[PDB]
Design a protein around this ligand. Structure first.
Ligand SMILES: Nc1ncnc2c1nc(Cl)n2[C@@H]1O[C@H](CO)[C@@H](O)[C@H]1O
Length: 385
């Protein structure tokens, strides 16, 4: 029953996703708000602890006690230059506990501090409860994914987050490996298969090159930008609309924190619409000083606003090919991962770079990793019996 069941979890930097392989198909499980992905956010309030959508929805009102980006800290030492650099951009406090970072917050009126693995375990607990609500019984066996460049310390702290959350961790697998499994790229028979995974998420960009030789996976190269993602494109839209509001009304809104946040969430929504329509409309009642902001933007203007950012995704692709010592024609498969790969201009740029090649994109890109993890979790639990 439950002992023969296993889930696949994509524990992402900004969003997490959970899947289950049953009756010959993967089911990506919707949360209690009907969303197939859940924000990797944990909020600490005066009465409760919030995880996911409810935590992301109150981030504006409670920025000091709303934790996110725990995956940027997991398995790292406080002194690490990555930690020191990132800390300058977070509104929550990061403290040092014997060269280990802890996030310090106010919870139910008391000062509390948590290890990144304790924060990630609260995200994992929510994903576990989402699966349990869908299945009707508690499931404890899980496959959890990590980026291909995670070292032993980051993988061990991710497994520890799984243990704290009450999960039996069957395996820690690489995110590009889970994506290649989702597309059945390890079941093409004999001979080495070279796969490039193009993963553009909410806050990170990763390029991975894998060789699959008779079911065996090998990471040939990893490249990317840890600080490039969908949120930079939302910010380019924000800057445009701040300048358009100034041209129409002769008023600078940039300093009004509420106006900028409402504009940011509307821009994110308009950006998503621009992936399937050639225009999107913004409808913000009383944006600033009682002034409604009802406007629109074409996909052409959006592509101009992010042009330099979209083009920058091709340098890590070339860098990964040179590190792997492979030419473009030596890559058998191109796989899209991350919600931002839905942007038509991004697909066009990657397709033209690979001389007009077809892209593997039929699986929801923000769901492909959980999909593959769910497939692996089913194979692993079946072999365990
Ligand atoms: N339809 C879309 N068109 C463009 N961007 C999208 C889309 N869906 C998501 Cl999710 N994202 C973005 O992907 C990230 C999460 O993986 C977020 O930045 C989200 O806005």
């Amino acid at each position: 029953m439950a002992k023969a069941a296993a889930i696949g979890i994509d524990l992402g930097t900004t969003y997490s996703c959970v899947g289950v392989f049953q009756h010959g198909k993967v089911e990506i499980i919707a949360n209690d708000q009907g969303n197939r992905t859940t924000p990797s956010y944990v909020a600490f309030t005066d009465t409760e602890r919030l995880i996911g959508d409810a935590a992301k929805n109150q981030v504006a009102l409670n920025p000091q006690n709303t934790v996110f980006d725990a995956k940027r800290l997991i398995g790292r030492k406080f002194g690490d230059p990555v930690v020191q650099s990132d800390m300058k951009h977070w509104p929550f406090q990061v403290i040092n506990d014997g060269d280990k970072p802890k996030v310090q917050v106010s919870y139910k009126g008391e000062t509390k501090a948590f290890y990144p693995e304790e924060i990630s375990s609260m995200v994992l607990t929510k994903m576990k409860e989402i699966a349990e609500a869908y299945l009707g019984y508690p499931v404890t066996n899980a496959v959890i994914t990590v980026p291909a460049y995670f070292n032993d310390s980051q993988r061990q702290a991710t497994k520890d987050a799984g243990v704290i959350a009450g999960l039996n961790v069957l395996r820690i697998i690489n995110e590009p490996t889970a994506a290649a499994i989702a597309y059945g790229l390890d079941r093409t028979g004999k001979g080495e298969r070279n796969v490039l995974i193009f993963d553009l998420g909410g806050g990170t960009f990763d390029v991975s090159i894998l060789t699959i030789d008779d079911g065996i996976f090998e990471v040939k190269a990893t490249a990317g930008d840890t600080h490039l993602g969908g949120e930079d494109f939302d910010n380019r839209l924000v800057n445009h609309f701040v300048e358009e509001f100034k041209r129409k009304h002769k008023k600078d809104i940039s300093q009004n924190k509420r106006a900028v946040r409402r504009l940011r969430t509307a821009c994110e929504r308009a950006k998503r619409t621009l992936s399937s329509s050639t225009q999107a409309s913004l409808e913000i009642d009383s944006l600033f000083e009682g002034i409604d902001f009802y406007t629109s933007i074409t996909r052409a203007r959006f592509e101009e606003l992010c042009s330099d950012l979209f083009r920058s995704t091709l340098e890590p692709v070339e860098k990964a090919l040179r590190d792997a010592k492979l030419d473009k024609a030596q890559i058998h498969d191109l796989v899209l991962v991350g919600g931002s790969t839905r942007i038509p201009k991004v697909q066009k740029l990657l397709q033209d770079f690979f001389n007009g090649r077809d892209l593997n994109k039929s699986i929801n890109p923000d769901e492909a990793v959980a999909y593959g993890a769910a497939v692996q979790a089913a194979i692993l639990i079946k072999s365990t019996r």
